[PDB]
Structure 1
Amino acid sequence: XXXXXXXXXXXXXXXXXXXXXXXXXXXXXXXSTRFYDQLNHHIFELERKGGILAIASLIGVEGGNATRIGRFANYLRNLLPSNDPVVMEMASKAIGRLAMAGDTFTAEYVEFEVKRALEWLEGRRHAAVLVLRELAISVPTFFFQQVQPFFDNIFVAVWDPKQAIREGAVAALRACLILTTQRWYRHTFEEAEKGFDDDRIHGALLILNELVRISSMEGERLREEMEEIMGFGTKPRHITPFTXXXXXXXXXXXXXXXXXXXXXXXXXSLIQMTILNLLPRLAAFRPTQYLQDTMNHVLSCVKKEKERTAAFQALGLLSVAVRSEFKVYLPRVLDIIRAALPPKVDATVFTCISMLARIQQDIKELLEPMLAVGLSPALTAVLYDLSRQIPQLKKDIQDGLLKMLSLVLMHDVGSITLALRTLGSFEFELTQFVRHCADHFLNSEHKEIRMEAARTCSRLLTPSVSQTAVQVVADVLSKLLVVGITDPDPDIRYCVLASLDERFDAHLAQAENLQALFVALNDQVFEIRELAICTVGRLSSMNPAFVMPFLRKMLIQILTELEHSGIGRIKEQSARMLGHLVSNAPRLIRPYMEPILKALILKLKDPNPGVINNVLATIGELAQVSGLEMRKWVDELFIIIMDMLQDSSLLAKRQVALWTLGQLVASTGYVVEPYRKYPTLLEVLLNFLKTEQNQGTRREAIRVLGLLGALDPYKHKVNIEMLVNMGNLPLDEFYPAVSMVALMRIFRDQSLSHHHTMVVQAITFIFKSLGLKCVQFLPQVMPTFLNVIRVCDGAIREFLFQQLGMLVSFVKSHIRPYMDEIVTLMREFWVMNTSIQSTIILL
């Protein structure tokens, strides 16, 4: 896009720049090569954030290539030596995305960064640390290639007086020790305890914790879950849609930690933060003297500020680990919580109150301040998971929680968003609210309110005999259908339409709703159109008298757009649409299967990849729906698919090719006989196993070898000189004979076009060294050599005629049989060109 591409480049150079980088990545999803390298170089030299956004995004989507790797490697190698913060971490993310591309140069690029990282071990030191952390996560194998340099250099470099290194290098030690445990430990504990004997505190405590934490995931698994905070009996659809040392040192890991936490209680915020993280995980390994040194730092940090968030997380682990002995410090903790909440940070306080239960009847009184705090996603996630683990009063929980929601929804924008997310996330017990919600969505100009109130109402209509209740549900769903047709914002239209599930099909099958749905089959958005035609097809069993005439009209129109529109996209969309009918309305389509299949075969014999892919996915869906009525056309379909399977030139994906072939063999029941008709079938299907890298595809290539049966080896047999040279001759003759044979092989084909001069010279020297015994080889050499002179071009011609002259001088009288051809050659290739004339006169 050239001018406009450089215009938006400087626009992204000078939120908005992340939306233009995501749009450039979206433009690279569809998509010259030189202009993209120049545009990347234009953004590089100028700003540095937009340059990293240009490099990393293109490589991931457009795909790593030898050209692109060789060029952009120089750009990445220039940024790392000297750069600003934030831009450095973005450049390190561009390394991780390059290293997970999965190319042949990845082995060189990763080991180039790792070797230079070991040389360093401040924009140099922290850069190498970010490189080692992301490579340890993404690439465990080549990260393990240098482990002895890793530990030795890092235990020196970590204990330098720096903070950014201590944050990352310990996380690199985390990624390394996890790989060591699953598959050094003495060298870790020695260098860590040497460091312990205020910069040399918070690093040693994390190293001792690594031996404790990895040995026992029970401590970490509580923290890992709090940070983040169908059915097996379902019948599948009848038509398949297309698709030791850490335990003997853990005691010393807590003993040398219950002193550091007692000494460095308030020395040099950062150290107190790492102490309050580590202390619970050490106590969860082995809980009283250890508890007293833990409890003094944790309890004192709760009253303080800038730590209250991490303090309760540590306190929640301590409450689970130390069960009975912690009960002494319950009045201290609960008084601080009763003082902390009135001010409304406390989003974590509720998460840890959930982990406290993870109980007594006192909690009943604790509910009246808890709910008075306010609506947060943590609070309602807690009370939901509270009633899961301890369902003593699940009725009283829902009583208070519905009373809270009622007080809220009786009465800014972002809160109403979250209030709807709450109302629609987990189950509840709501008629007036929904008729009032029918007012809010219509009378709200906010896109996010409408989109959430839509998600909420669609979720809250899961309870779906009194006539009045039905008429209410009918009214709301009629209003919803109106929104799904008339709303401008297609996202809101998509959410509403997507939310009209199987659950509502009793209501959607009503006459009025079906007249609406028909209008919806001509929506501007193809995806909504797809979803609407699916719904009407699904209802063709409920009310076929109405639905079947309308799907017939739609079928004719779809097949018209397929056959008569001469456009890739429209035809691709039309096949997809015919797809949704076959799957959702198989009864309707069965009588019309022979017309449809002839139209589709005609499309397969037409001279865009996505069109053929959707046509194949439809034929595959017709197979199952046909129910043995397509046998007559089986032979034609098989030939076409086999022609398309062999070779990679065909645009159509092998995956769907193999999938539709599976569905044909399966439904129609063509077994054993196809093997006889097409004997290369077993050679094609055993070639995919040696070529394909995709799992899904390899699975299909197996599933098709399954359905076709296991052929008897004999039935497959029905369906389908150098040593000899030496066996005869003496060695002095053998050596010319094998040399000649080896030269003759290269002679033929286009291999000679590369090794022309070399091959010809060797043959001449052989004949000269032999003498008149070369006459033997004449019938081999001459016919080829003459045909080489005929099809050779340019400079080589002259050289060949020179060497033919040598040949003729050696062969002498024996050249008589081939002389006539040589003259013809000369006659044809004699020109007024001075060069060839002197050559031919010599010949």
Structure 2
Amino acid sequence: TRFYDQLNHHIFELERKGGILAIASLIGVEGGNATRIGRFANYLRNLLPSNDPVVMEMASKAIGRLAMAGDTFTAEYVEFEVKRALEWLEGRRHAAVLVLRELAISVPTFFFQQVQPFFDNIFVAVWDPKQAIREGAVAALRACLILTTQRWYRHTFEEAEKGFIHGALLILNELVRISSMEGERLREEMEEISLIQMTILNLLPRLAAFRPTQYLQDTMNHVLSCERTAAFQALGLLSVAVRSEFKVYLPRVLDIIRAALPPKVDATVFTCISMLARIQQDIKELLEPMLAVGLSPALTAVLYDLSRQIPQLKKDIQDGLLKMLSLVLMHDVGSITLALRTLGSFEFELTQFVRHCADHFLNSEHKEIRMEAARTCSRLLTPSVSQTAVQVVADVLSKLLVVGITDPDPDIRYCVLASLDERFDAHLAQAENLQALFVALNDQVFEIRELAICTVGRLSSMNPAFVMPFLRKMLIQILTELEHSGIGRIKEQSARMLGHLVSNAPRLIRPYMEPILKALILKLKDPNPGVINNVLATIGELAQVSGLEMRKWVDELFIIIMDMLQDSSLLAKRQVALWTLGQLVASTGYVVEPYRKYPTLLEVLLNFLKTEQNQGTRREAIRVLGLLGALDPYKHKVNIEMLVNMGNLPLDEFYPAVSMVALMRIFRDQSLSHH
């Protein structure tokens, strides 16, 4: 961990967004705590005070992610840091504001009881001339409030208006939201699809529900006083929260937003129009400046969410996007991938365009784009059907495959072979693709074969001329090479080919199952989970294909799989053995007496139920337990000291006896080494 532990220090000392963003997808993901808590916290404690949004928002998430661990170091962090950031909410400082927002919620059993002290701390903290605290720290009071709903506002509301624009505003909004679970569930619903400006706007969606309307009548006046240009989300948010006559304010709102609609507060503005559909005629009018935006991931995603919010305007929105995205595509490689991704993913009514950009992408050295573009071009090809479109799909995907063969980089290789999506069958079944796949299948690098066989397997049902004898050859040659060539790490990759070479080509497997299982089971006996997991899955499917015809090999296979299953406490991907035994017995119709001939099976299955934590593995264990007929407890049974001393002797002798027995019990154990 040391590498990332030291990087965390330098990343917080810090470009900066890149570092913090990238580390944010290891923080809380790797699962380590010995260092992620114990020293990382010192970096947060001393480095965070000077950190602007949105980078600090990611750091805030990192804070909550440390509190979630719940260990001893975590508890020390949660109390040390929040206690300092109750008083630091002191303008040095600003991260303390966000500590409260997340940390208070992470361990609610403590913070629930300190609602009012936090208000007093804000009362004092806001005095700092910086005014950063007056906005942020006061808004952070959600942290000290919302927990009340899990088990004050009835009077704090009046205190907020009387004792605390900034103070009363920021407290009022959260005190109203906490009046019900809906106050936040409305936002959770929304997120499927100066701060005082935003908060005055936020009051309207909530004061409408608390006290239904003078509050709204004055609140919008305050919005306009905080000059008039604003990210007017209040009426959209209200038109979800209630629709408490939000439209009455639009004649003084719609004429302010509109100028900011072009891509040129500006971070939202789109969201200030969308939600008012819930003025459909005016949104319809105003899509023009919204659809004129460039190829940004953000504005494009916002327009997509707009369509999802207003399906009846989707066509107008999507036609705009279709033109917008297509023009960039037709026109570079660093931005075309967004055009292609959204042109392929969005519900649009797109062929030669891909051929063109594909020719451009294939000659670029920007590996990030080569990776993204290969799969993204595959996404756009989806709609395809003229012969031109057929040649476009086969040519573009064939060229990406050629990259997947000739490019030394395994990540680009993966992306371009992964791009051969199932939706493009009957196009990938052409010689233009299958001949390149042939080259891939006999390539010198086994990773190429490993990836390419899955596509070839799928295509075996469409064009056997460039699949079927190749799969026959690879099954024999790869199964031979696993032993005869002395292959090392590559052997695992070869093992993966097995199964990929079987699952989708049944015309090979039935008559070949005999030499396959004899050698495949031999491989099962040969030794490595990297091999055995694939051998097991493949044999399982082979048993499914033949059914009862292979009963003569069940004792051998069953014993081998069972032995592999019994050691699952170390070989912790052998849920596979549970599935394989289940399918083997179900497919073959093996006499339902493995609990007599190999009794341990049932003990193992029960141990899985009370060892493994994965619901899937337990479910499979249950499926295997129920595969065999219910067993009569009688037949089951057929198939399978302190008190003791105490009453037999005087206490004067008993005492030494139990002391000596306890000591000798310890003395005979290996743990004596420490004692």
* TM-score w.r.t. length of structure 2: 0.78
Deviation string 1:491-517 (CA, Å, 9 cap, x unpaired) is: 555444323222222122234432121
Match of 2:176 in 1: 212
SS of corresponding position for 1:92: helix
Deviation string 1:599-620 (CA, Å, 9 cap, x unpaired) is: 4444444565534444444444
Unpaired runs of 5+ in structure 2?
A: none
Greater alpha carbon shift after TM alignment, 207-216 vs 392-401: 392-401
The answer to whether the 8 A contact 1:56-1:98 is kept is no
- Structure-2 change in CA distance of 1:480 and 1:429 (3 Å): farther
- Structure-2 change in CA distance of 1:491 and 1:730 (3 Å): closer
SS of corresponding position for 2:37: helix
The answer to whether the 8 A contact 2:205-2:234 is kept is yes
Deviation string 1:215-270 (CA, Å, 9 cap, x unpaired) is: 45666566667677xxxxxxxxxxxxxxxxxxxxxxxxxxxxxxxxxxxxxxxx44
Unpaired runs of 5+ in structure 1?
A: 1-32, 229-268, 302-306, 753-843
SS of corresponding position for 1:68: coil
**Partner Cα separation in structure 2 for residue 455 and residue 35 of structure 1:** 32
The answer to whether the 8 A contact 1:575-1:618 is kept is no
The answer to whether the 8 A contact 1:276-1:314 is kept is yes
Deviation string 1:293-330 (CA, Å, 9 cap, x unpaired) is: 122233455xxxxx888532224335666858554554
Q: CA deviation at 1:743?
A: 5.4
- Structure-2 change in CA distance of 1:206 and 1:120 (3 Å): closer
The answer to whether the 8 A contact 1:284-1:318 is kept is no
Deviation string 1:727-761 (CA, Å, 9 cap, x unpaired) is: 55555665565556555545544576xxxxxxxxx
**Partner Cα separation in structure 1 for residue 546 and residue 224 of structure 2:** 73
Q: CA deviation at 1:181?
A: 1.3
Q: CA deviation at 1:691?
A: 3.3
- Structure-2 change in CA distance of 1:739 and 1:161 (3 Å): same
Match of 2:207 in 1: 282
The answer to whether the 8 A contact 2:274-2:309 is kept is no
Higher fraction of helix? 1
Identity %: 100
**Partner Cα separation in structure 1 for residue 634 and residue 435 of structure 2:** 62
Match of 2:410 in 1: 490
- Structure-2 change in CA distance of 1:431 and 1:656 (3 Å): closer
**Partner Cα separation in structure 1 for residue 393 and residue 21 of structure 2:** 49
**Partner Cα separation in structure 2 for residue 727 and residue 653 of structure 1:** 52
Q: CA deviation at 1:536?
A: 1.3
**Partner Cα separation in structure 2 for residue 85 and residue 359 of structure 1:** 33
- Structure-2 change in CA distance of 1:376 and 1:635 (3 Å): same
**Partner Cα separation in structure 1 for residue 120 and residue 359 of structure 2:** 68
- Structure-2 change in CA distance of 1:106 and 1:696 (3 Å): farther
- Structure-2 change in CA distance of 1:439 and 1:130 (3 Å): closer
- Structure-2 change in CA distance of 1:628 and 1:191 (3 Å): farther
Deviation string 1:181-227 (CA, Å, 9 cap, x unpaired) is: 1345457547645632xxxx434423322232244566656666767
The answer to whether the 8 A contact 2:207-2:216 is kept is no
**Partner Cα separation in structure 1 for residue 19 and residue 356 of structure 2:** 50
SS of corresponding position for 1:630: helix
SS of corresponding position for 2:43: helix
**Partner Cα separation in structure 2 for residue 693 and residue 77 of structure 1:** 35
**Partner Cα separation in structure 2 for residue 668 and residue 659 of structure 1:** 14
The answer to whether the 8 A contact 2:599-2:640 is kept is yes
- Structure-2 change in CA distance of 1:651 and 1:291 (3 Å): closer
Deviation string 1:596-644 (CA, Å, 9 cap, x unpaired) is: 3344444444565534444444444444344334433333344344444
- Structure-2 change in CA distance of 1:474 and 1:651 (3 Å): closer
The answer to whether the 8 A contact 2:97-2:133 is kept is yes
The answer to whether the 8 A contact 2:394-2:430 is kept is no
Greater alpha carbon shift after TM alignment, 38-47 vs 369-378: 38-47
Q: CA deviation at 1:146?
A: 7.0
Aligned length: 671
The answer to whether the 8 A contact 1:83-1:123 is kept is no
Deviation string 1:694-730 (CA, Å, 9 cap, x unpaired) is: 3333333333333345433222222226545455555
Q: CA deviation at 1:589?
A: 2.8
Greater alpha carbon shift after TM alignment, 691-700 vs 725-734: 725-734
Deviation string 1:744-781 (CA, Å, 9 cap, x unpaired) is: 545544576xxxxxxxxxxxxxxxxxxxxxxxxxxxxx
- Structure-2 change in CA distance of 1:670 and 1:106 (3 Å): farther
- Structure-2 change in CA distance of 1:709 and 1:225 (3 Å): same
**Partner Cα separation in structure 1 for residue 269 and residue 279 of structure 2:** 16
* TM-score w.r.t. length of structure 1: 0.64
**Partner Cα separation in structure 2 for residue 639 and residue 280 of structure 1:** 66
2:9 is aligned, of 28, 38, 41, to 41
SS of corresponding position for 1:638: helix
SS of corresponding position for 1:506: coil
- Are residues 1:63 and 2:27 paired? no
**Partner Cα separation in structure 1 for residue 538 and residue 304 of structure 2:** 45
The answer to whether the 8 A contact 2:446-2:494 is kept is no
**Partner Cα separation in structure 2 for residue 472 and residue 747 of structure 1:** 78
**Partner Cα separation in structure 1 for residue 244 and residue 112 of structure 2:** 44
**Partner Cα separation in structure 2 for residue 460 and residue 531 of structure 1:** 22
- Structure-2 change in CA distance of 1:459 and 1:683 (3 Å): closer
The answer to whether the 8 A contact 2:139-2:170 is kept is no
Q: CA deviation at 1:424?
A: 3.2
The answer to whether the 8 A contact 1:309-1:346 is kept is no
Q: CA deviation at 1:550?
A: 0.7
Q: CA deviation at 1:591?
A: 3.0
The answer to whether the 8 A contact 1:82-1:123 is kept is no
Deviation string 1:88-138 (CA, Å, 9 cap, x unpaired) is: 999877665544446565456545655676798859976666555443454
- Structure-2 change in CA distance of 1:446 and 1:319 (3 Å): same
2:603 is aligned, of 683, 703, 719, to 683
Deviation string 1:332-367 (CA, Å, 9 cap, x unpaired) is: 444435544579565633333222223555666545
- Map residues 294-693 of structure 1 onto 2, 5 A cutoff: 294-301=219-226, 310-318=230-238, 325-340=245-260, 344=264, 346=266, 348-359=268-279, 361=281, 366=286, 369-372=289-292, 402=322, 416-430=336-350, 433-434=353-354, 436-437=356-357, 440-441=360-361, 454-455=374-375, 457-464=377-384, 470=390, 474=394, 478-479=398-399, 481-482=401-402, 484-486=404-406, 491=411, 493-522=413-442, 528-544=448-464, 546-566=466-486, 568-606=488-526, 609-646=529-566, 650-670=570-590, 672-693=592-613
- Structure-2 change in CA distance of 1:371 and 1:698 (3 Å): closer
Deviation string 1:23-47 (CA, Å, 9 cap, x unpaired) is: xxxxxxxxxx999999999999999
Match of 1:192 in 2: 160
- Structure-2 change in CA distance of 1:625 and 1:101 (3 Å): farther
- Are residues 1:225 and 2:145 paired? no
The answer to whether the 8 A contact 2:204-2:216 is kept is no
**Partner Cα separation in structure 2 for residue 368 and residue 56 of structure 1:** 37
Q: CA deviation at 1:533?
A: 0.2
- Structure-2 change in CA distance of 1:216 and 1:521 (3 Å): farther
Greater alpha carbon shift after TM alignment, 712-721 vs 361-370: 361-370
Deviation string 1:139-174 (CA, Å, 9 cap, x unpaired) is: 445655877876776676577766555566556542
**Partner Cα separation in structure 1 for residue 392 and residue 55 of structure 2:** 57
The answer to whether the 8 A contact 2:533-2:576 is kept is yes
Q: CA deviation at 1:534?
A: 0.8
Match of 1:76 in 2: 44
**Partner Cα separation in structure 2 for residue 624 and residue 311 of structure 1:** 61
**Partner Cα separation in structure 2 for residue 683 and residue 218 of structure 1:** 49
Q: CA deviation at 1:551?
A: 0.6
The answer to whether the 8 A contact 1:417-1:452 is kept is yes
